[PDB]
Design a binder for this molecule. Structure first.
Ligand SMILES: CCCCCCCCCCCCCCCCCC(=O)OC[C@H](CO[C@@H]1O[C@H](CO[C@H]2O[C@H](CO)[C@H](O)[C@H](O)[C@H]2O)[C@H](O)[C@H](O)[C@H]1O)OC(=O)CCCCCCCCCCCCCCCCC
Ligand code: CLA
Ligand code: CLA
Ligand code: CLA
Ligand SMILES: C=Cc1c(C)c2cc3nc(c4c5[nH]c(cc6nc(cc1[nH]2)C(C)=C6CC)c(C)c5C(=O)[C@@H]4C(=O)OC)[C@@H](CCC(=O)OC/C=C(\C)CCC[C@H](C)CCC[C@H](C)CCCC(C)C)[C@@H]3C
Ligand SMILES: CC(C)=CCC/C(C)=C/CC/C(C)=C/CC/C(C)=C/CC/C(C)=C/CC/C(C)=C/CC/C(C)=C/CC/C(C)=C/CC/C(C)=C/CC1=CC(=O)C(C)=C(C)C1=O
Ligand SMILES: CCCCCCCCCCCCCCCC(=O)OC[C@H](COP(=O)(O)OC[C@@H](O)CO)OC(=O)CCCCCCCCCCCCCCC
Ligand SMILES: CCCCCCCCCCCCCCCC(=O)OC[C@H](COP(=O)(O)OC[C@@H](O)CO)OC(=O)CCCCCCCCCCCCCCC
Ligand SMILES: CC1=C(/C=C/C(C)=C/C=C/C(C)=C/C=C/C=C(C)/C=C/C=C(C)/C=C/C2=C(C)CCCC2(C)C)C(C)(C)CCC1
Ligand SMILES: CC1=C(/C=C/C(C)=C/C=C/C(C)=C/C=C/C=C(C)/C=C/C=C(C)/C=C/C2=C(C)CCCC2(C)C)C(C)(C)CCC1
Ligand SMILES: CCCCCCCCCCCCO[C@@H]1O[C@H](CO)[C@@H](O[C@H]2O[C@H](CO)[C@@H](O)[C@H](O)[C@H]2O)[C@H](O)[C@H]1O
Ligand SMILES: CCCCCCCS[C@@H]1O[C@H](CO)[C@@H](O)[C@H](O)[C@H]1O
Ligand SMILES: CCCCCCCS[C@@H]1O[C@H](CO)[C@@H](O)[C@H](O)[C@H]1O
Ligand SMILES: [Ca+2]
Ligand SMILES: [Cl-]
Ligand SMILES: [Cl-]
Ligand SMILES: [Fe+2]
Ligand SMILES: [Mg+2]
Lengths: 172, 38, 81, 30, 342, 36, 33, 38, 504, 34, 64, 34
């Protein structure tokens, strides 16, 4: 639906019918956007951390950059020197071109997988199903967290579109 | 009265003191052996 | 560079692999035996497939007291015959 | 009342888009 | 004065492969124990006595279903120290009672403090501004609000998130059914900050890579960059014109752009943390009172708001008995809410 | 007796647009909850 | 609909007071030399 | 002794294959024994 | 010019105008307290301290005046229900008036200190530059704080020269303001021992007196002065903010869990007294004692105080509210008028059944009735076509003991189901829902609102400490990094010790 | 408990085998740092 | 700068800007009090938490 | 030329030693039957 609560309705019913949280493509999608936001604050904080001093303390440091200037406005070597020591040297970029490529590629690829998760659950290839996967020696079902997810999904399934189903299986 | 949990409290205090003590003991030792050149 | 020997140097050296062709399988086998002897179950208190329930009961042995929790589990463990 | 409020706020935002695009500070190279 | 303190300081701050520092005394044990406790628990430890769940590789769970689960609700907010009055020094009992959960959460909290002190420490030695540390306050606000404040407002640690993939998914669905958390405007702001952060990440990366100056002859453009070159490697002017004509507006100040990239995800995480602080007290954005008054009186009035509450009602009734075993909910079939046929 | 610590204050035009957009969007978000 | 009627003045002051603040600062920046 | 003897590409290949062996064993386990639902 | 988010930095080097700004802030806060108390006095209903106490009415500052001994009005009532009292000047109105007058005096002082900012006192006698000796200021202010802390505990709380503080029984039935003696044993550290509160202020006050004298007489070590930048006033802001968010988390926790300084008659019950059926257990015990002593069911329950029954109701649980459900609790379920009495349910066999109470987590809850062994005996079904436990099938009736419905029994299914729906909330009350146009949806109490605001503020002030601490320790690079930063300082190996050029 | 000895024994032999192959250089490294 | 009667009285109290004690001074004594304070906070925390249970200290409203 | 026992050596092995032990434990679990 084209609305805010209609979006939530779509997401809730999607979980009931395809177990999207347990699909690896939605999981890659979450890595895409959690990673994208991490690297966004990351790149933002490093570049801001190594701005070359060009201003007094009473002005915004943003005036130290002039639109169209030829020279870079921060010291990438100092940024590399800080972040390489935060982790280790070879976990830090020193090539700005490949750094900015990684920034481009990580969220874009993750969101491609997210879109492909929706597109392939459209044809009912659903998330992993571990309902009653763990069985004891006698054959008692031992519940896992997957079975608790299933209980929540059953509640969404039995209430959604409450007047729309006449037959026991909600096949589409 | 020293309840079981107050005894347990003292055991926690001693354990952590021992852990911090050996850690700094080892660290001071090594820093004295491998000094920087100035 | 920070002075330590490069990793590519070390892992292509015969001496590295003489040492680690023993230490790596030995650790792997120690891990296997920790499970195969059943010792993992008893260190951590994890049920075996035959010790989740008593033969005819279907109720969880759920801890319900804070300061007698240790005795409750011990009581649950007795009732497995 | 509440419908008027929602639409009024919305309409202000569309007006703000107009001024931000066409009456922006021009970027000037130096 | 070059006493023992200054000599220790010398050794802690040596330029080695893994920088240590004074912060490392806190950071390294706590991070290592939090990670070691999570791998130990997910590999070997059960949740049978606290939740009625299997939860380790040893019991047959896989990477998606293992967890270190929260303690039993009867533990309250107990620290669950190994030497405390519940486990009484018994390591095995401690594991069965959920002691690994507070172990991970508390060593994790102090490890995160240590990582932020490390960001400050290294920044001061290299001589950079400490904005990376300031940005890391947002992950700390999230961890503290979700894993500590939220259960502390509730009845016990049991209702905190458990440390596992599927256990966290259960946590998301619990928050929809019980708190209607999608409706909460503080979550909404968090979503905007996370998705806007992902967007800024993709667009700035793609913009740099497609306004590059030709500074080499190869078809691979990565080599045509030198870390000490003084020139911008891409054209801010061409980038500005492209977006002005595609989108209407564009960045013109490269320093503002990169501060904005800090600002947006960090502010978003901070807002979501505030809303979870409210959920600790059940101070939810659950309802719109005006919608409920109309719907109570007018059985033809239906919106997507009212549709979603019915879904929440299903979640609560169908998941509560298994999800809250200490409550001993017995809900006969005839009281379960269900639509027609299903 | 003029105080030497006075300083002029600035708000440029892009900051005004940014600020107004933030306030209007926050109002558009929170108004529904104010009316409830 | 039975909305809270304070919602109106709450929304109006929410927009107006900070918007007016920003306009004062901007206009007196333009009027500087 | 001296680093250089065993070529890195052979180290990489042998290590890669051990990863594939151990990960295949875990996927095998999803269909047998505990957690197989059988 | 200055960006908008920096306008207040013009005070950093101007102690006189800093004092003026701090005077103006104090005047605003004092005026808020006076005007909030007047608004509360104009809306407060004092006529029923049993079923309409202040915490049902959205009162936020009234409980704080009552906590320390202000309990009466010049118009002749008190919050404990007495009439014809004379509180003297320090009534609720006299306290509000005093805060208003203080606000105006501080406003005038702020104007003086703003105009006459160039006072010789603020200049360093050797250099003539503006300068504040922060280390000696700390010992002076800590010394004054210690004296005030000590006098608060020794004179006000003890009743030596002062009214004492609010104290009550474990069930919040008989609270009043009482002089309180210090507890000097280990129970003084029990949060529920009011005696520990007195002891704390006497003992910590003395310690602060001593520590204050120390900090006046002993200068800081050179090593701590450089490391903490004790010449930079912004280091005081950073550590002051850290102490303040520490305190804010503590008062949020003690408000939520309860303590001797957050009594239930002033702020309402806690959520945990519902979780653990704290009041329901006490009610049952009293009914047993009567039943064991020969009284009838009707006499046992009619002897239960209405105030105690009202605590055993989920509508007074502060974990039942909503973020945008505004106003007093009375705006939700109504103004409580009377206990209806204890509902006893029975089936056709005459077995007693017990309604399963609503846990605080659930906005809604099904209606389920068990026998004493927790076996389901009756419910309100959703799908009727395979109901086996309906009230109709099981012949469920309800009888009331105590309260206004005492001695009555109802047998028609619709009326019985009506009271069973109410019984999931605990004891059942009659409410006036018309006076306030109450909407029937639960709101939280001042305990809930206090806790939420202070946890949120505590968390945000953590960011303030990080920000101002960063600005203190990194002042030299606030505008940017050195334009001549040598690549050797940041590349690996050149120095043995990171950032130390003497270790090349 | 014999299973404790069964588990630690492969680890103990691995410690002693690595010490055999490294002790000449180990003593040489400790000597240089003195 | 403007002199006042009250300013003259308080002058000695704002005259030692920047005066320090050599070296580490009283730092080691400060560290002792910090560590004692840490154990104090731990005691009162664990009592409230019921991790530390003492005789005759009943952490409950039932202590009035 | 290079040392053998450094901080890097310790950091590597505190991670790598338990990892291998755990991998052998989890490998053995793939043959447990109920
Ligand atoms: C920012 C950067 C920070 C960086 C990270 C720092 C990491 C540090 C880690 C600190 C860990 C704190 C652990 C707190 C445990 C706790 O609280 O444990 C809780 C205990 C109280 O225990 C609870 O008390 C409850 C109420 O009981 C009371 O009421 C009952 C019912 O009537 C009975 O009468 C009972 O006898 C009586 O005790 C229930 O009994 C619960 O089961 C029981 O767990 O308080 C206590 O230990 C102490 C309470 C006072 C101090 C609280 C301040 C700190 C936490 C503030 C969070 C605010 C959250 C409020 C919600 C929002
Ligand atoms: C160095 C970093 C570090 C930090 C910050 C922590 C922090 C913590 N640990 Mg962890 N731990 C660590 C390293 C660390 N640990 C290491 C290296 C190990 C491996 C041995 C462990 C193994 C471990 C276990 C098994 C447990 C913890 C637990 C805890 C928690 C409770 C600690 C406590 O109460 O001690 C209190 C002790 C102190 C504060 C020591 C201070 C001593 C003072 C300053 C000096 C005065 C003492 C005096 C000299 C002695 C008087 C005694 C006398 C009166 C008898 C706390 C989160 C517990 C937990 O997680 O609960 C779930 C727990 O059960 N830790
Ligand atoms: C610690 C602060 C505090 C607390 C805990 C209380 C508590 C209370 N007040 Mg009081 N009050 C306060 C301060 C406080 N007050 C102040 C400063 C004033 C002067 C304005 C008042 C004036 C006042 C009046 C006039 C009334 C109350 C009433 C009440 C009661 C009902 C509360 C309610 O419905 O709130 C509802 C709370 C909300 C709807 C929360 C709002 C959340 C905000 C809007 C979020 C803003 C988001 C922001 C824009 C995001 C920025 C993002 C950006 C950074 C990017 C409750 C007992 C009422 C009462 O019952 O009296 C008997 C009443 O009539 N108060
Ligand atoms: C005792 C508390 C205290 C004091 C005396 C100061 C003082 C200062 N702050 Mg700090 N700060 C604090 C707490 C404090 N701060 C807290 C809790 C935070 C986290 C939110 C911060 C985060 C912070 C940042 C990010 C910055 C400062 C900056 C500053 C400096 C300039 C501020 C300015 O001109 O704002 C002008 C503000 C306005 C003109 C309008 C702001 C209106 C706000 C957002 C909403 C209205 C609030 C309402 C009126 C009052 C609510 C009170 C609340 C406590 C309930 C000044 C030294 C700035 C600086 O470092 O300059 C170099 C700066 O960038 N502060
Ligand atoms: C789930 C999402 C998520 C993860 C997994 C994550 C992870 C990380 N973020 C880091 C950094 C950052 N994240 C940042 C902004 C963000 N980060 C984001 C969200 C995430 N960030 C988002 C959305 C933002 C936008 C604001 C910044 C600005 C930084 C950094 O500067 C820092 C970095 O260096 O990045 C490259 C690194 C800190 C390393 C460390 O603390 O070591 C120490 C390890 C410790 C202290 C152990 C912590 C223990 C934790 C708290 C509990 C235990 C967890 C278990 C072991 C595992 C549980 C797994 C189950 C839940 C499935 C680490 C890679
Ligand atoms: C008893 C005990 C233990 C006592 C200890 C006491 C003591 C003294 C100990 C010291 C001894 C010691 C070292 C012990 C070690 C023990 C031990 C092993 C501890 C380990 C703890 C541990 C494993 C922690 C794990 C932490 C962890 C998971 C880190 C992950 C890091 C990681 C995945 C990084 C990859 C992410 C990455 C490369 C992101 C970059 C993407 C990005 C956009 C970057 C932005 C960016 C990059 C640039 O590059 C530059 C340029 C700019 C512009 C820029 O935008
Ligand atoms: C994870 C990041 C992966 C990035 C891609 C992999 C790098 C691959 C890369 O780009 O370069 C490859 C790089 C090359 O090393 P060399 O053989 O040249 O070694 C030379 C140096 O040792 C000389 O000082 O390999 C490494 O640096 C080792 C990586 C693992 C080292 C693990 C050390 C132990 C970790 C301890 C914890 C550290 C964190 C502490 C703070 C929390
Ligand atoms: C080669 C296979 C790639 C498949 C996916 C595509 C990834 C790259 C597309 C991202 C678009 C971002 C916006 C444009 C950003 C942009 O402008 O790109 C610019 C960047 C450099 O451009 P150049 O012109 O220098 O080089 C590209 C061509 O011109 C040939 O040199 O492009 C590349 O680096 C191509 C990389 C190909 C090899 C990448 C392989 C990656 C596979 C990694 C495995 C992923 C599996 C994940 C499992 C979870
Ligand atoms: C808790 C505790 C403790 C500790 C312990 C520890 C510290 C441990 C450690 C542990 C550890 C440290 C472990 C480890 C493990 C590891 C593992 C288990 C791994 C695995 C891996 C894998 C399986 C992989 C996979 C993959 C991926 C992920 C991607 C790439 C590809 C591949 C496929 C390769 C103590 C005693 C103190 C005390 C008590 C408690
Ligand atoms: C001059 C004078 C006088 C007078 C005075 C007066 C009359 C005063 C008044 C005063 C006042 C009358 C004051 C008031 C104040 C108030 C305030 C200051 C408030 C504030 C508020 C706020 C700040 C809020 C906020 C918020 C909101 C709005 C929403 C929600 C959230 C929050 C809470 C954030 C006299 C005769 C005495 C004498 C001398 C002279
Ligand atoms: C109801 C909501 C209302 C919110 C209230 C908002 C109040 C905000 C007040 C903003 C006041 C700004 O204060 C204003 O600052 C400017 C510079 O910035 C000062 O201006 C000064 O500097 C400028 C700039 O060189 C000189 O040209 C000028 O001659 C000098 O006076 C003004 O003398 C002062 O009037
Ligand atoms: C806690 C640590 C406080 C430092 S303490 C300080 O340390 C010096 C080492 O340089 C000694 O020379 C000195 O005697 C000692 O008091
Ligand atoms: C069918 C209505 C008559 C049966 C008794 C109803 C339960 S009791 C009823 O509950 C109302 C809230 O719903 C209160 O406002 C009112 O005071 C009270 O009498
Ligand atoms: Ca079998
Ligand atoms: Cl639906
Ligand atoms: Cl159908
Ligand atoms: Fe960039
Ligand atoms: Mg298997």
């Amino acid at each position: 639906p084209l609305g805010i609560s209609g979006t939530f309705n779509f997401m809730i019913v999607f979980q009931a019918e395809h177990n999207i949280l347990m699909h690896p493509f939605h999981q890659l999608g979450v890595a895409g956007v959690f990673g994208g936001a991490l690297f966004c604050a990351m790149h933002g904080s490093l570049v801001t951390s190594s701005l070359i001093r060009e201003t007094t303390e009473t002005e915004s440091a943003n005036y130290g950059y002039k639109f169209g200037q030829e020279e870079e406005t921060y010291n990438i070597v100092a940024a590399h020197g800080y972040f390489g020591r935060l982790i280790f040297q070879y976990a830090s970029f020193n090539n700005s071109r490949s750094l900015h490529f990684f920034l481009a590629a990580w969220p874009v690829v993750g969101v491609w997988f997210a879109a492909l998760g929706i597109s392939t659950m459209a044809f009912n290839l659903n998330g992993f199903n571990f309902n009653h996967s763990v069985i004891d020696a006698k054959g008692n079902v031992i519940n896992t967290w997957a079975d608790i997810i299933n209980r929540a999904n059953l509640g969404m399934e039995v209430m959604h579109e409450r007047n729309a189903h006449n037959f026991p299986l909600d096949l589409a | 009265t020293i309840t079981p949990s107050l005894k347990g409290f003292f055991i926690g205090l001693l354990s952590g003191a021992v852990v911090l003590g050996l850690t700094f003991a080892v660290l001071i030792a090594i820093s004295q052996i491998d000094k920087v050149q100035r | 560079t920070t002075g330590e020997r490069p990793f590519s140097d070390i892992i292509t050296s015969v001496r590295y692999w003489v040492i680690h062709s023993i230490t790596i399988p030995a650790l792997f086998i120690a891990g296997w035996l920790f499970v195969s002897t059943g010792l993992a179950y008893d260190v951590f208190g994890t049920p075996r497939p035959d010790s989740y329930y008593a033969q005819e009961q279907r109720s969880i042995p759920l801890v319900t007291d804070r300061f007698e929790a240790k005795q409750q589990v011990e009581t649950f463990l007795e009732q497995l015959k | 009342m509440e419908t008027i409020t929602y639409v009024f706020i919305f309409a202000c935002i569309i007006a703000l888009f107009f001024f931000a695009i066409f009456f922006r500070e021009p970027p000037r190279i130096t | 004065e070059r006493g023992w303190f200054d000599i220790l300081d010398d050794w802690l701050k040596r330029d080695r492969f893994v920088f240590v520092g004074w912060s490392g005394i806190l950071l390294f044990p706590c991070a290592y124990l939090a990670l070691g406790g999570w791998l130990t628990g997910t590999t070997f430890v059960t949740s049978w006595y606290t939740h009625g769940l299997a939860s380790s590789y040893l019991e047959g769970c896989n990477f998606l279903t293992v967890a270190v689960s929260t303690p039993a609700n009867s533990m309250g907010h107990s620290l669950l120290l190994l030497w405390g009055p519940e486990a009484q020094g018994d390591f095995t009992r401690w594991c069965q009672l959920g002691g690994l959960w507070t172990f991970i959460a508390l060593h994790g909290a102090f490890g995160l403090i240590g990582f932020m002190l490390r960001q400050f420490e290294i920044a001061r030695l290299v001589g950079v501004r400490p904005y990376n540390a300031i940005a890391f306050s947002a992950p700390i606000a999230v961890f503290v609000s979700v894993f500590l404040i939220y259960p502390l407002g509730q009845s016990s640690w049991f209702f905190a998130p458990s440390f596992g993939v599927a256990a966290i998914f259960r946590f998301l669905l619990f928050f929809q059914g019980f708190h209607n958390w999608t409706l909460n405007p503080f979550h909404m702001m968090g979503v905007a900050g996370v998705l806007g952060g992902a967007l800024l990440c993709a667009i700035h990366g793609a913009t740099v890579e497609n306004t590059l100056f030709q500074d080499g002859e190869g078809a691979s453009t990565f080599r045509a960059f030198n870390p000490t070159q003084a020139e911008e490697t891409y054209s801010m002017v061409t980038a500005n014109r492209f977006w002005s004509q595609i989108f209407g507006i564009a960045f013109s100040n490269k320093r503002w752009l990169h501060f904005f990239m800090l600002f947006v995800p960090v502010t978003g995480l901070w807002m979501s943390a505030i809303g979870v602080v409210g959920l600790a007290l059940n101070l939810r954005s659950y309802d719109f009172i005006s919608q409920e008054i109309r719907a109570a009186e007018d059985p033809e009035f239906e919106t997507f708001y009212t549709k979603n509450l019915l879904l929440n009602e299903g979640i609560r009734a169908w998941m509560a008995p298994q999800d809250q075993p200490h409550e001993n909910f017995v809900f006969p079939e005839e009281v379960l809410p269900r639509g027609n046929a299903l | 007796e003029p105080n030497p610590n006075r300083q002029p204050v600035e708000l440029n035009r892009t900051s005004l647009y940014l600020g107004l957009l933030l306030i209007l969007v926050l109002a558009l978000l929170f108004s529904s909850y104010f009316f409830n | 609909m039975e909305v809270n009627q304070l919602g109106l003045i709450a929304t109006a002051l929410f927009v107006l007071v900070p918007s007016v603040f920003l306009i004062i600062l901007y206009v007196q920046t333009e009027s500087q030399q | 002794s001296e680093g250089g003897r065993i070529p890195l590409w052979i180290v990489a290949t042998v290590a890669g294959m051990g990863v594939i062996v151990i990960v295949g064993l875990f996927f095998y386990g999803a269909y047998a024994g505990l957690g197989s639902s059988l | 010019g200055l960006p908008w988010y920096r306008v207040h930095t013009v005070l950093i080097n101007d102690p006189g105008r800093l004092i003026a700004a701090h005077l103006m802030h104090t005047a605003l806060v004092a005026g808020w307290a006076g005007s909030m108390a007047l608004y509360e006095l104009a809306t407060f209903d004092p006529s029923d301290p049993v079923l309409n106490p202040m915490w049902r009415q959205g009162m936020f500052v009234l409980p704080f005046m009552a906590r320390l001994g202000v309990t009466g009005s010049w118009s002749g009532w008190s919050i404990t229900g007495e009439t014809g009292i004379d509180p003297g000047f320090w009534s609720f109105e006299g306290v509000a008036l005093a805060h208003i007058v203080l606000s105006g005096l501080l406003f005038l002082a702020a104007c003086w200190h703003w105009v006459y900012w160039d006072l010789e006192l603020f200049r360093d006698p050797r250099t003539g530059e503006p300068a504040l000796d922060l280390p000696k200021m700390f010992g002076i202010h800590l010394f004054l704080a210690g004296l005030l802390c000590f006098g608060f505990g020794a004179f006000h709380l003890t009743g030596l020269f002062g009214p004492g503080m609010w104290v009550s029984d474990p069930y919040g039935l008989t609270g009043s303001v009482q002089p309180v003696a210090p507890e000097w044993g280990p129970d003084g550290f029990n949060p529920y021992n009011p005696g520990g509160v007195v002891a704390h202020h006497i003992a910590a006050g003395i310690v602060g007196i001593i520590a204050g004298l120390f900090h006046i007489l002993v200068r800081p070590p050179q090593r701590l002065y450089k490391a903490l930048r004790m010449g930079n006033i912004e280091t005081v802001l950073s550590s002051s903010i850290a102490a303040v968010f520490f305190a804010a988390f503590v008062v949020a926790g003690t408000m939520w869990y309860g303590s001797a300084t957050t009594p239930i008659e002033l702020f309402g019950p806690t959520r945990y007294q519902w979780d653990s059926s704290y009041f329901q257990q006490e009610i049952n015990r009293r009914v047993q004692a009567s039943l064991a002593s020969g009284a009838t069911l009707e006499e046992a329950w009619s002897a239960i105080p209405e105030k105690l029954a009202f605590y055993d109701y989920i509508g007074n649980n502060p974990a039942k509210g909503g973020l945008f459900r505004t106003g007093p609790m009375n705006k939700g379920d109504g103004i409580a008028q009377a206990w209806k009495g204890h509902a006893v349910f029975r089936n056709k066999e005459g077995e007693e059944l017990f309604v399963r109470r609503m846990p605080a987590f659930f906005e809604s809850f099904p209606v389920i009735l068990t026998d004493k062994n927790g076996v389901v005996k009756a419910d309100i079904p959703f799908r009727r076509a395979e109901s086996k436990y309906s009230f109709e099938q099981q012949g469920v009736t309800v009888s009331f003991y105590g309260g206004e419905l005492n001695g009555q029994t109802f047998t028609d299914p619709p009326t019985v189901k009506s009271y069973a729906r109410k019984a999931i909330f605990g004891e059942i009350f009659e409410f006036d829902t018309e006076t306030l146009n109450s909407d029937g949806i639960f709101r939280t109490s001042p305990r809930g609102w206090f806790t939420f605001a202070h946890a949120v503020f505590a968390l945000l002030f953590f960011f303030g400490h990080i920000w101002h601490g960063a600005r203190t320790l990194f002042r030299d690079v606030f505008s940017g990094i050195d334009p001549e930063l040598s690549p050797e300082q940041v590349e690996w190996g050149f120095y043995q010790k990171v950032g130390d050029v003497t270790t090349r | 408990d014999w299973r404790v000895l069964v588990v630690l024994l492969p680890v103990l032999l691995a410690a002693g085998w690595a010490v055999r192959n490294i002790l000449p250089y180990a003593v040489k490294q400790v000597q240089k740092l003195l | 700068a403007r002199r006042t009667w009250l300013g003259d009285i308080l002058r000695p109290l704002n005259s030692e800007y920047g005066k320090v004690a050599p070296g580490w001074g009283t730092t080691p004594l400060m560290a002792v009090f910090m560590g004692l304070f840490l154990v104090f906070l731990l005691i009162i925390l664990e009592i409230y938490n019921s991790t530390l249970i003492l005789d005759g200290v009943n952490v409950s409203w039932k202590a009035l | 030329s290079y040392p053998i026992f450094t901080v890097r050596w310790v950091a590597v092995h505190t991670l790598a030693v338990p990892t291998i032990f755990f991998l052998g434990a989890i490998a053995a679990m793939q043959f447990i039957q109920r």
